[PDB]
Design an enzyme around this catalytic site. Structure first.
Site, PDB file in Angstrom:
ATOM      1  N   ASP A  22     -52.152  17.679-124.340  1.00 10.38           N
ATOM      2  CA  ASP A  22     -53.609  17.718-124.335  1.00 10.38           C
ATOM      3  C   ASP A  22     -54.090  19.123-124.683  1.00 10.38           C
ATOM      4  O   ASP A  22     -53.313  19.960-125.148  1.00 10.38           O
ATOM      5  CB  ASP A  22     -54.138  17.324-122.956  1.00 10.38           C
ATOM      6  CG  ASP A  22     -53.717  18.298-121.874  1.00 10.38           C
ATOM      7  OD1 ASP A  22     -52.496  18.488-121.680  1.00 10.38           O
ATOM      8  OD2 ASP A  22     -54.607  18.880-121.219  1.00 10.38           O
TER       9      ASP A  22
ATOM     10  N   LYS B  38     -54.985  21.460-122.655  1.00 13.98           N
ATOM     11  CA  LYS B  38     -54.359  22.443-121.782  1.00 13.98           C
ATOM     12  C   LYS B  38     -53.021  22.925-122.349  1.00 13.98           C
ATOM     13  O   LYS B  38     -52.649  24.089-122.185  1.00 13.98           O
ATOM     14  CB  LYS B  38     -54.153  21.856-120.383  1.00 13.98           C
ATOM     15  CG  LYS B  38     -55.455  21.534-119.663  1.00 13.98           C
ATOM     16  CD  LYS B  38     -55.219  21.170-118.203  1.00 13.98           C
ATOM     17  CE  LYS B  38     -54.479  22.285-117.462  1.00 13.98           C
ATOM     18  NZ  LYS B  38     -55.152  23.609-117.588  1.00 13.98           N
TER      19      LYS B  38
ATOM     20  N   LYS C 212     -59.571   9.545-128.948  1.00 14.42           N
ATOM     21  CA  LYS C 212     -59.769  10.712-128.120  1.00 14.42           C
ATOM     22  C   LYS C 212     -60.797  11.641-128.754  1.00 14.42           C
ATOM     23  O   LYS C 212     -60.781  11.877-129.964  1.00 14.42           O
ATOM     24  CB  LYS C 212     -58.437  11.436-127.910  1.00 14.42           C
ATOM     25  CG  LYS C 212     -57.515  10.697-126.957  1.00 14.42           C
ATOM     26  CD  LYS C 212     -56.185  11.389-126.806  1.00 14.42           C
ATOM     27  CE  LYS C 212     -55.378  10.738-125.703  1.00 14.42           C
ATOM     28  NZ  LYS C 212     -56.093  10.797-124.395  1.00 14.42           N
TER      29      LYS C 212
ATOM     30  N   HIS D 185     -56.551   1.123-115.523  1.00 11.16           N
ATOM     31  CA  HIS D 185     -55.909   2.203-116.264  1.00 11.16           C
ATOM     32  C   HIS D 185     -54.383   2.114-116.267  1.00 11.16           C
ATOM     33  O   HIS D 185     -53.758   1.968-115.215  1.00 11.16           O
ATOM     34  CB  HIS D 185     -56.350   3.559-115.692  1.00 11.16           C
ATOM     35  CG  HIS D 185     -55.538   4.719-116.185  1.00 11.16           C
ATOM     36  ND1 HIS D 185     -54.433   5.193-115.512  1.00 11.16           N
ATOM     37  CD2 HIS D 185     -55.646   5.468-117.310  1.00 11.16           C
ATOM     38  CE1 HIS D 185     -53.894   6.185-116.200  1.00 11.16           C
ATOM     39  NE2 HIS D 185     -54.610   6.371-117.295  1.00 11.16           N
TER      40      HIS D 185
HETATM   41  O1  LIG Z   1     -57.157   6.568-120.584  1.00 12.92           O
HETATM   42  C1  LIG Z   1     -55.998   7.008-120.728  1.00 12.92           C
HETATM   43  O2  LIG Z   1     -54.970   6.293-120.804  1.00 12.92           O
HETATM   44  C2  LIG Z   1     -55.796   8.553-120.827  1.00 12.92           C
HETATM   45  O3  LIG Z   1     -56.880   9.229-120.159  1.00 12.92           O
HETATM   46  C3  LIG Z   1     -54.448   9.004-120.229  1.00 12.92           C
HETATM   47  O4  LIG Z   1     -54.405   8.593-118.866  1.00 12.92           O
HETATM   48  C4  LIG Z   1     -54.180  10.548-120.293  1.00 12.92           C
HETATM   49  O5  LIG Z   1     -54.147  11.129-118.979  1.00 12.92           O
HETATM   50  C5  LIG Z   1     -52.863  10.958-121.002  1.00 12.92           C
HETATM   51  O6  LIG Z   1     -51.750  10.311-120.360  1.00 12.92           O
HETATM   52  C6  LIG Z   1     -52.881  10.599-122.506  1.00 12.92           C
HETATM   53  O7  LIG Z   1     -52.268   9.580-122.895  1.00 12.92           O
HETATM   54  O8  LIG Z   1     -53.536  11.370-123.247  1.00 12.92           O
HETATM   55 MG   LIG Z   2     -58.559   7.987-120.075  1.00 15.06          MG
END
Ligand SMILES: O=C(O)[C@@H](O)[C@H](O)[C@@H](O)[C@@H](O)C(=O)O
Ligand SMILES: [Mg+2]
Ligand SMILES: O=C(O)[C@@H](O)[C@H](O)[C@@H](O)[C@@H](O)C(=O)O
Ligand SMILES: [Mg+2]
Ligand SMILES: [Mg+2]
Ligand SMILES: [Mg+2]
Lengths: 358, 373
Positions: free
Chosen positions: B22, B24, B173, B304
């Site tokens: 990500d 970070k 994203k 989720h």
């Molecule tokens: O909604 C989701 O699946 C993402 O928000 C993920 O949980 C995320 O933390 C990370 O694991 C990713 O896949 O970018």
């Molecule tokens: Mg998410």
């Protein structure tokens, strides 16, 4: 600036069906030669959990500036992002957080109380004098008098048995035995349902107790608020909560006159200070739960007179002892928390790990 | 009166085909995620019934979960497996000072899931039918391996491929410093896929209030299914303000670790789509409590992760839910989820219908068991 270069953690089982307490110790050292000691604990299950998590996130502290405590608290939380902002993960974080505050106070050549800023040099204290719901009143009264003789400032009695009239008679007995000048508190340990708590609290009103602690389930905020609103006697609760957010809920509901945060349980001094800030703002009183070696400093920094409970359980972990005189616990004047590990810890340590260079 | 006689737990480290990095990570503040720690729980009864359950930790937390589960596990021996919520409370009390959220309850959640699996099987029903379902298939979507830094043309190809294979929507994203860039990327995907393919965006808590306000306003005419985690997971008041003002549904909740936290979201009306994670919130029991609160509040559900479990839970929800398809956990099991015409089929086999694959042993770092089989 300074930077953390070494961290050591260890799980210590302090011998006392509770037969022992699991303590998590955190030691932090910086390139500038500064050192800090901190700890968290678990009375029941949780010791191995706190340690394992602490061991996995400890490396994230290496190379960081020890003075940015809240920043580091947040960093470690993120290190275990899916682990939540409460419970075992933050309690493990707490041990480190306490070490960092100890380190910063020592850096200033001040006790933790003075670093934060104090309002008093001693805090009102009380104890249970080994009293339990099943302890014969005669025995309890003797132990209670011995405590008052040794300087304790109040007595907290266990209540909440099925037969309420019995608890009332027991408290009446202690009051008669000790006199009107000895403050008394009762702890129902969440044993009453709402209607019973209403009836028991009403009967206790004329007793002028300092407080009635945990009459209801730890999370029944609306129930506690209703009791507090209606009765003059202060309602105390919060020892079971494990985050600033849960305490925030208590305060929002006005469910407690005396908030009882446990620093180790809520994630360290950093979250404890935010809770204390919310409590002060709301006009509440403070009665930290357990760990007096740490809470005596935190209570000294609260604006309104607090109460701290005297326990002997954790004394063997440290070389230093807390001083009590005339119903008040003296705030230590040594730098930081004023605590160093007793040599006995060596024998009780079951797990240990370290990273970095000293 | 059946009784639990054997319990086994194991910590399995599942390697990920491609590392997750990500913002970070890209800013050099954290290492890429290359594995997931899975906590597996196996429960067996005198009556010969069996249950398999699991929890997981994305970042730090696996060792903690396993450590706690190991310490509370024996408290299950001799108990009636059918009293699931009672046992959930019992294990919680066994570690009462650990709280009712986070690592402790996530460890409990692995046992909880195994008990539900076992009860469904006992009835010869899939978990979905045991609870009672409203549909035999659930709308699904995926990210098609797309990340904030994935070249737009590549993302579009992979997305088209997913749709070809039956995926029902695409989540993109967003959240980078330059918002105009996110907008152009969504525009390109919309153009590449057409008006008929549902699209959602995930900001992953990267916006502050004012920025979220502006981005949500620009995204309105796009008619996205939802804008996920535009703000910090705990900024309930901020999420509620956005949800109230914009037509586009606001989704959030994946980071919450207890029924009480989700209760706070619902109380603030901070989300149109609630995104609980059964493993993260403590298992099926707390998940069910959350869903009831959500249904009562008239909200929508978008569980989720963990599709192998959430497909069953989503089938039991009243209003049409969305479940995300991930291939991450597939290697752990022998069974596979079926996708067709934009929906994933609810498995019809008993319980969760999952059995550990042969590859699981090799990835197992820690394990323990109590009782006798
Ligand atoms: O909604 C989701 O699946 C993402 O928000 C993920 O949980 C995320 O933390 C990370 O694991 C990713 O896949 O970018
Ligand atoms: Mg998410
Ligand atoms: O207020 C207290 O100290 C008690 O409420 C204890 O926390 C309690 O859990 C138990 O440790 C006891 O000593 O009765
Ligand atoms: Mg108490
Ligand atoms: Mg009152
Ligand atoms: Mg809206």
């Amino acid at each position: 600036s300074d930077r953390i270069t070494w961290v050591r953690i260890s799980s210590c089982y302090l011998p006392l069906p509770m037969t022992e307490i699991a303590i998590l110790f955190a030691e932090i050292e910086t390139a500038g030669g500064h050192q800090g000691l901190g700890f968290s604990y678990s009375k029941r299950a949780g010791g191995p959990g706190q340690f394992a998590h602490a061991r996995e996130i400890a490396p994230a502290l290496i190379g960081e500036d020890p003075s940015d405590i809240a920043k580091l608290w947040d960093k470690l939380c993120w290190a275990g992002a899916s682990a939540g902002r409460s419970g075992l993960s933050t309690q493990a974080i707490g041990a480190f957080d306490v070490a960092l505050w100890d380190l910063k106070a020592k850096r200033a050549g001040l006790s933790l109380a003075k670093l934060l800023g104090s309002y008093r040099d001693s805090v009102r204290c009380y104890n249970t004098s080994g009293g339990f719901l099943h302890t014969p009143i005669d025995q309890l009264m003797v132990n209670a008098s011995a405590s008052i003789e040794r300087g304790i400032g109040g007595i907290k009695l266990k209540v909440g048995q099925p037969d309420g009239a019995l608890d009332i008679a027991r408290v009446t007995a202690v009051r008669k035995h000790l006199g009107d000048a000895v403050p008394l508190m009762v702890d129902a340990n969440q044993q009453w349902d709402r209607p019973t708590a209403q009836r028991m609290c009403r009967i206790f009103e004329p007793f002028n107790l300092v407080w009635i602690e945990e009459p209801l389930d730890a999370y029944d905020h609306e129930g506690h608020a209703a009791l507090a609103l209606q009765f003059d006697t202060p309602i105390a609760t919060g020892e079971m909560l494990t985050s600033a957010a849960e305490h925030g809920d208590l305060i929002r509901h006005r469910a407690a006159d005396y908030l009882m945060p446990d620093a180790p349980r809520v994630g360290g001094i950093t979250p404890f200070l935010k809770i204390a800030s919310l409590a002060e703002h709301a006009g509440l009183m403070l009665a930290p739960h357990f760990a007096m070696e740490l809470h005596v400093h935190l209570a000294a920094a609260y604006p309104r007179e607090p109460w701290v409970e005297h326990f002997e359980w954790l004394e063997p972990l440290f070389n230093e002892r807390i001083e009590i005189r005339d119903g008040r616990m003296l705030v230590p004047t040594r730098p930081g928390l004023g605590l160093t590990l007793s040599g006995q810890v060596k024998a009780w340590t079951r797990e240990e790990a370290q990273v970095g260079t000293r």
